[PDB]
Design a protein around this ligand. Structure first.
Ligand code: NPO
Length: 127
């Protein structure tokens, strides 16, 4: 499935090149510009655990998730991953725990040492 495919066929987008965050672009977005640090970014997404369970989805909430890029308001993999996206892009990210919730996890839904899968759509970004 999609998690396996990004695990096996994704590109390492980390600065450390430690394969902690792997990406596949599913839909190419618009132009060349990506958001900048501090921008208000609007995304639709779903997240799955390695046991197949969907632990989060903005589509299911009928509202985008909104955050300021690069401020640690989201897991490291998102600050890194979303920063690589063009407006309109859809990508898959495979995030190892060191770029997600680590050994702590996030009660109740994210276990310790969890590798996470996301599909993310960048809807808009604004300074
Ligand atoms: O990926 N993330 O950092 C998130 C995004 C939204 C949420 O409700 C929880 C975690």
């Amino acid at each position: 499935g999609a998690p396996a495919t990004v695990t096996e066929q994704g590109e390492d987008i980390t600065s450390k090149k430690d394969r902690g965050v792997l990406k596949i672009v599913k839909r190419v977005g618009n132009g060349e510009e990506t958001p900048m640090i501090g921008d208000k970014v609007y995304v639709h997404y779903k997240g799955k655990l390695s046991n197949g369970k969907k632990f989060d989805s903005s589509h299911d909430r009928n509202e985008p998730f909104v955050f300021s890029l690069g401020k640690g308001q989201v897991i490291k993999a998102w600050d890194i991953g979303v920063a690589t996206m063009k407006k309109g892009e859809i990508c898959h990210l495979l995030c190892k725990p060191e770029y997600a919730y680590g050994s702590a996890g996030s009660l109740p839904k994210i276990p310790s040492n969890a590798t996470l899968f996301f599909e993310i759509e960048l809807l808009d970004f604004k300074g």
